[PDB]
Ligand binder design. Structure first.
Ligand SMILES: O=C(O)Cc1ccccc1Nc1c(Cl)cccc1Cl
Length: 121
């Protein structure tokens, strides 16, 4: 659930989901359209796509359980949705951590009209 994802984000990046990644680029936080502005934005695009593979699940609200083995993220067994949701978020966190070096504040609160074009998952 959104509640777990943000905590995962924070642990991973030292940054707070809101407002650091809640309105970043064209896909972080609301997704929809356009060309991902950068690596961080790309993580969100993939992440939206990931959630997209689970039409019959509820990513924002279904809670899952996970643990850290030394500093690794390990999703604990739950319902199938729960397991695939977790794998989706885990990927996004690692991705964020992997591009923190190019995170740019000029993409915070990015305006909608500056996101043109569809991109397929
Ligand atoms: O992919 C992301 O960076 C995050 C993301 C994607 C889809 C929907 C919500 C969020 N984030 C989000 C979070 Cl992480 C907390 C509170 C409110 C919102 Cl809208």
């Amino acid at each position: 659930s959104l509640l777990e994802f943000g905590k995962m984000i924070l642990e991973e990046t030292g940054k707070l989901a809101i407002p650091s990644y809640s309105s970043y680029g064209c896909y972080c936080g609301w997704g929809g359209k356009g060309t991902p502005k950068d690596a961080t934005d790309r993580c969100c695009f993939v992440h939206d796509c990931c959630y997209g593979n689970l039409p019959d699940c509820n990513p924002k609200s279904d809670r899952y359980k996970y643990k850290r083995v030394n500093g690794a993220i390990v999703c604990e067994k739950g319902t199938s949705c729960e397991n695939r949701i977790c794998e989706c978020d885990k990927a996004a966190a690692i991705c964020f951590r992997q591009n923190l070096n190019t995170y740019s504040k000029k993409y915070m609160l990015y305006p909608d009209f500056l996101c043109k074009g569809e991109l397929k998952c």
